[PDB]
Amino acid sequence: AETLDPLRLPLQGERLIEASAGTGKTFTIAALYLRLLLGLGGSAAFPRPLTVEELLVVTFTEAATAELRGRIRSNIHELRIACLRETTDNPLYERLLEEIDDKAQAAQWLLLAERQMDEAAVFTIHGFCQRMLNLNAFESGMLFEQQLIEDESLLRYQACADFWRRHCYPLPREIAQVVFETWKGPQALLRDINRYLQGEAPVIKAPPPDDETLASRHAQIVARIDTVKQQWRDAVGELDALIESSGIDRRKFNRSNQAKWIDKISAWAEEETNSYQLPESLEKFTPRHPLFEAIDQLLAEPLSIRDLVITRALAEIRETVAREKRRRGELGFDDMLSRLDSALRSESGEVLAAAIRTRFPVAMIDEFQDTDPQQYRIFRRIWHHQPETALLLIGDPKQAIYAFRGADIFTYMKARSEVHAHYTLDTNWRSAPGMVNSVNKLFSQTDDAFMFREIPFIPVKSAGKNQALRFVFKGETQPAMKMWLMEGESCGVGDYQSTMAQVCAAQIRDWLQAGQRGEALLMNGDDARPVRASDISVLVRSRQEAAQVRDALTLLEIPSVYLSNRDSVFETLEAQEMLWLLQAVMTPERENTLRSALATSMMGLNALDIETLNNDEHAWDVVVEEFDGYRQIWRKRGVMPMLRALMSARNIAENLLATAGGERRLTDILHISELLQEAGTQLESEHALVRWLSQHILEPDSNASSQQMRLESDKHLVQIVTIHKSKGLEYPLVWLPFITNFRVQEQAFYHDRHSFEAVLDLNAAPESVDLAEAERLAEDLRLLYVALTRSVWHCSLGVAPLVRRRGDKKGDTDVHQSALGRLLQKGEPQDAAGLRTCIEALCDDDIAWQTAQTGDNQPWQVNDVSTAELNAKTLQRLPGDNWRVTSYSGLQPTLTPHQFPRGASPGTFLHSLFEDLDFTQPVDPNWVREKLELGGFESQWEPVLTEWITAVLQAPLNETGVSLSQLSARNKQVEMEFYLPISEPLIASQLDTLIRQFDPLSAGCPPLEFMQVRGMLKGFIDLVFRHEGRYYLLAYKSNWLGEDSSAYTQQAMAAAMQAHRYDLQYQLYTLALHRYLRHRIADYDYEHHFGGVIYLFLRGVDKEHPQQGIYTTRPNAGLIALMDEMFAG
Amino acid sequence: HSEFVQPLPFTLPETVPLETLQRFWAHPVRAFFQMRLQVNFRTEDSEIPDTEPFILEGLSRYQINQQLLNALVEQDDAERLFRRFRAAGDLPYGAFGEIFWETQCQEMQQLADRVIACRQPGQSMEIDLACNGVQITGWLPQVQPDGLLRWRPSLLSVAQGMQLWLEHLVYCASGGNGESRLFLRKDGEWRFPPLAAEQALHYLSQLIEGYREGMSAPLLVLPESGGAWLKTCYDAQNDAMLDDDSTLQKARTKFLQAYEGNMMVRGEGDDIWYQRLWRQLTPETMEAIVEQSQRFLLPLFRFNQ
DNA sequence: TTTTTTTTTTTTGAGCGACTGCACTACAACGTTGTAGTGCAGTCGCTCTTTTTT
């Protein structure tokens, strides 16, 4: 490999950047981004400068893409400032400024980059795949709009249930017994094949043929057993083998067991006594007959139906999932990768890749260790050897720890074998040089410590500015790596975990006890820093040992937070308490739910309080009354107002904050409240939110929003973080108590060392088990490197002679089967004394060891201090006056029109019919039929409806007898919308007396009550029409439910006007028309131009009665001026 | 937040039924919650599953095993009960339901070979007792002249042993010389020998004192974890509790195993009645539960054979 | 077409591998007996990761 310079990297063809742990990878990506933007390098430069919309940056984590985009934006702004000023404070920026000859054009390009940074092409893998599928949808064959699903386990379980229904149900008993012996149900099969159903489907070594069913395999195994049974029945009754000292004389009794074995062929599991009839075992303890050879041939391979069912499940379930998502039109995360791979797999889609070469003729791919083989197949399809495009694979083979998710280091080894150039970062800027020397001493004991030929380890170099980092104790300077060797010959797993957790808790309380007195310090040159609780971090691998560390640390009065906690908030007790509280609020009549909800830990009541509440009936009456008030707030204001009034009236937030350990409970309660308020806005029903909360309690599925957050950030806490969640982070002091714990992989799923493809061996072959255990050991070594390279000042390791075998004292330990023992014992099996000598052999100034001492003196010292005085501001006056823009509604034989259905919707339909119809043109019956078809009413009403409409239109409504047909299109104006201002507070008592002074219809009609309205008033006049130089207003009313006979006289219409309170609406209409005619026509007189107001009752118009149906009223011409003076000011 | 445990006034009534004592010694904290202050935490029922039951686990398997054990204790036709359970859909479809019914019939026949090996026809009798001025009225079902015979398709647990010990105390106090036997699954057996009336009345007065103590203060007697701690510390050979540090560590290990279970078995600490009192198991409350279990659950393992 | 009641929970781990005790024969030491090796059965530790992409 070669060293990497950011200003000397040739951006041509494919380049592979190997950025080690702790190196400035995020700085190098920004430097290469500035190099691609400005076009620097000279001979090794790009042929043309590229814009922001042509630079493609690929990083998997979305927060990493956001942080990288912000860092690139800050670097763009800093380089623009340094180019405008021709000076800088950074040496790499100094060389960047020295490489360019022109300053104005580079500054203009950086300004354009700063302006176009919003349209930057910095996306994720699946985001870039979705953008390429949506953009060039023709060559791929993708829908323009689709619905992404976050969880795919439900459809996968449905397809597995469909496979179990269509495969396991019609089987007979002799096959279903073996199917039940393999798996209990489809859930165990789904748990087996869940790592293979997602992502790329692997290649099965020696698959069954497509015509072989379960019955054919069962009959083949039955015939294979029956041949051995026939050969045992033919060769029975004889014994010619020599009697050995190991061979007991009871073996014929075992043969008698075989005499009890050959009864029927309905069974599947043979006897163990056939293991006594093996020629390889009888010779080691003389076999002449080939019956022993046939028995050994029968026991050579396992008689299992499991592989055929697994192959049929992998062929059927994925196809059913794809069929269901193609029918529903949904898409998944890996479905974008599969669609892009199938698009580039086609003939025309290669030209689509050329369009991608038209789109982005460059690629900088970060985190190449977490790369699926479909992703590398796509990147080889686009950017293999084409000119003018550059490929920069920035990654680290020593950090590939996501093999469970879908990543594969063999794809990275294939990529390293395909490319020619290799570049590495020599300088390490994170850790102290002692930790760097400890890592370079531990990992370079033997050659190829990562056990793969394509993953080489290099000695890294520390930083010059961080060469004085020292973690000092009270006694002397503490070394970098301190391998705490647990004393003993052989120990278990749980006892070793408990002792190392106690040793780690003792070290934490010793570093925190001496840290608060200025004894243990972190020193950078002359600067010193005390060690707080947030500096020490414990690196674990699973959740059980994390809970063990948390319990062993809270036993010594030390609070610890879990950063890797992905548990849902709906699975705790607080969700059940919120459900009980919502059930008590929704149903407060039954006292059982209210009594069960009041005694929860959220309310904080004692047993004596519950007893006195059950004894005193008046206190329970007050409780029921305030819970009914909470229900009224919940129905009128929402979820969060009810919860805030409950937390303010009961004062449970102050009680939870005063309680030690209740802050996490209060944050979980607030998060559950926020989720309930988010889910309650989309549901109009009140019980639907309670059912949704009960469903999310019963559904333990984890979303991005429904996880637990950090309880506090101000108080320093010991942070527990897993090895996968510690990638890219930084910790001062790191403790690794369970770095010696390993796990043996049972399933045979490996990768070929030549073709670099995934090979799944369903048979129990030991070669596939060893080839999978080699990849497991490589993954454990990568996890060991990731967990070791996060410490800055000090790392501590827990070494112990752990024996995975159940034997107590066998003379050998299994530390060589772990990742740490392969580097300590140099890949050789040794003992506890051998492990101790291997620890004591590599002893330097940075690497030391000590024994594990169990002991406790005192938990901690709180050293509390009094809180500062504070108060809350109070609003002196009202936030705003009563300003509201309202309307009139806010201030308040067989076919006949009498038999018409009375409602708001038929009234609006008749209003739309009178609005859309032209008054000059005659009414056409087919138009009325088309309008009734568009509205959806009955077709039989139409010939009565058109003659009723013509009878209404023929009837004149005026004091002179003017009909509606005499009004031209210029004279009419339908649905005039007006806004009326008012600056005075509208008092009802000062307005109703002024109305009653002039309006004769206000003899009865007691006044309505409405608040002071200051602002605008909306209104919609139905019709305004002029005739012979005189304006007229016309409104329509069409409810008329209570009349069927001819009783709609002027008295009944006046009673309807007094009851429905249309007098105020008509007076505001006259005021609006007066103001409009005053504003429009100059020299306007109210008596000369205005003529009157007409109300039209549609169901009251008769052919013989011209007065019935219409209602003409004219004001006294004195109320209008006083109302204008009142509304004006 | 003050502690939920408070000394409450409680007067012991004259007539205390046997069903109240059985509901108390089945779960003491639940009986303190749902009967003294009448607070019963009502949990919502589980949702309807999206698919047919392919396996049998939980309450449905226990009900099937209980009906199969009640059918095989009278030597009835198991195939008729198989057709009855298959006609309701509670069994899996096809051959898998037949396989499940065959293995459950094998297990229940293996249990019934021990159950009806010493079974005699017995009737339900009345119990009227007067202990320390407290009247106990109730009924005991299936009282055979050999003693007490109970069978349940469950595992070896301390709550069923406490129930059998309470039934043996309420049976031996009014006549009834004979043993009391309970047969569980996986060769589990609770046996108590016959005792005199004075020792039975003394232990019944001790249980009455524990009942009247459980109504005032929450009686912290964990059956499962306390019984595991006790049987780790008890020695039946010498009839004395050991005090060495190795037994004190193994009892703490068994208590932490029985309180908080694994990822497959729901432990005793995962309960709505215990999380209301404390959120984290403190060693002071652990020693209090240990002392209460040594005070109360000691005749369970003292007379066990 | 009218209308009645009702408050009790339960259950849930099993395969892999070792420790120890009893029986069974092979073979050498002193026909018979003691020691050693192997097979079967009752009893008991132990343990089952990590995660996010619009």
Swiss-Prot record, chain A:
<feature type="region of interest" description="ATPase, DNA-binding and helicase activity, interacts with RecC">
    <location>
        <begin position="1"/>
        <end position="835"/>
    </location>
</feature>
<keyword id="KW-0479">Metal-binding</keyword>
<keyword id="KW-0067">ATP-binding</keyword>
<dbReference type="InterPro" id="IPR027417">
    <property type="entry name" value="P-loop_NTPase"/>
</dbReference>
<keyword id="KW-0413">Isomerase</keyword>
<keyword id="KW-0234">DNA repair</keyword>
<protein>
    <recommendedName>
        <fullName>RecBCD enzyme subunit RecB</fullName>
        <ecNumber>3.1.11.5</ecNumber>
        <ecNumber>5.6.2.4</ecNumber>
    </recommendedName>
</protein>
<feature type="active site" description="For nuclease activity">
    <location>
        <position position="1035"/>
    </location>
</feature>
<dbReference type="GO" id="GO:0000724">
    <property type="term" value="P:double-strand break repair via homologous recombination"/>
</dbReference>
<keyword id="KW-0227">DNA damage</keyword>
<keyword id="KW-0347">Helicase</keyword>
<feature type="DNA-binding region">
    <location>
        <position position="743"/>
    </location>
</feature>
<comment type="function">
    <text>A helicase/nuclease that prepares dsDNA breaks (DSB) for recombinational DNA repair. Binds to DSBs and unwinds DNA via a rapid (&gt;1 kb/second) and highly processive (&gt;30 kb) ATP-dependent bidirectional helicase. Unwinds dsDNA until it encounters a Chi (crossover hotspot instigator, 5'-GCTGGTGG-3') sequence from the 3' direction. Cuts ssDNA a few nucleotides 3' to Chi site, by nicking one strand or switching the strand degraded (depending on the reaction conditions). The properties and activities of the enzyme are changed at Chi.</text>
</comment>
<feature type="binding site">
    <location>
        <position position="1036"/>
    </location>
    <ligand>
        <name>Mg(2+)</name>
    </ligand>
</feature>
<dbReference type="Pfam" id="PF00580">
    <property type="entry name" value="UvrD-helicase"/>
</dbReference>
<dbReference type="InterPro" id="IPR014017">
    <property type="entry name" value="DNA_helicase_UvrD-like_C"/>
</dbReference>
<dbReference type="GO" id="GO:0003677">
    <property type="term" value="F:DNA binding"/>
</dbReference>
<comment type="subunit">
    <text>Heterotrimer of RecB, RecC and RecD. All subunits contribute to DNA-binding. The C-terminus interacts with RecA. Interacts with YgbT (Cas1).</text>
</comment>
<dbReference type="InterPro" id="IPR000212">
    <property type="entry name" value="DNA_helicase_UvrD/REP"/>
</dbReference>
<feature type="domain" description="UvrD-like helicase ATP-binding">
    <location>
        <begin position="1"/>
        <end position="432"/>
    </location>
</feature>
<feature type="binding site">
    <location>
        <position position="429"/>
    </location>
    <ligand>
        <name>ATP</name>
    </ligand>
</feature>
<dbReference type="GO" id="GO:0015616">
    <property type="term" value="F:DNA translocase activity"/>
</dbReference>
UniProtKB/Swiss-Prot annotation, chain B:
<comment type="function">
    <text>A helicase/nuclease that prepares dsDNA breaks (DSB) for recombinational DNA repair. Binds to DSBs and unwinds DNA via a rapid (&gt;1 kb/second) and highly processive (&gt;30 kb) ATP-dependent bidirectional helicase. Unwinds dsDNA until it encounters a Chi (crossover hotspot instigator, 5'-GCTGGTGG-3') sequence from the 3' direction. Cuts ssDNA a few nucleotides 3' to Chi site, by nicking one strand or switching the strand degraded (depending on the reaction conditions). The properties and activities of the enzyme are changed at Chi.</text>
</comment>
<comment type="subunit">
    <text>Heterotrimer of RecB, RecC and RecD. All subunits contribute to DNA-binding. Interacts with YgbT (Cas1).</text>
</comment>
<comment type="subunit">
    <text>(Microbial infection) Lambda virus GamS protein interacts with the enzyme without displacing any of the subunits.</text>
</comment>
<comment type="similarity">
    <text>Belongs to the RecC family.</text>
</comment>
<protein>
    <recommendedName>
        <fullName>RecBCD enzyme subunit RecC</fullName>
    </recommendedName>
</protein>
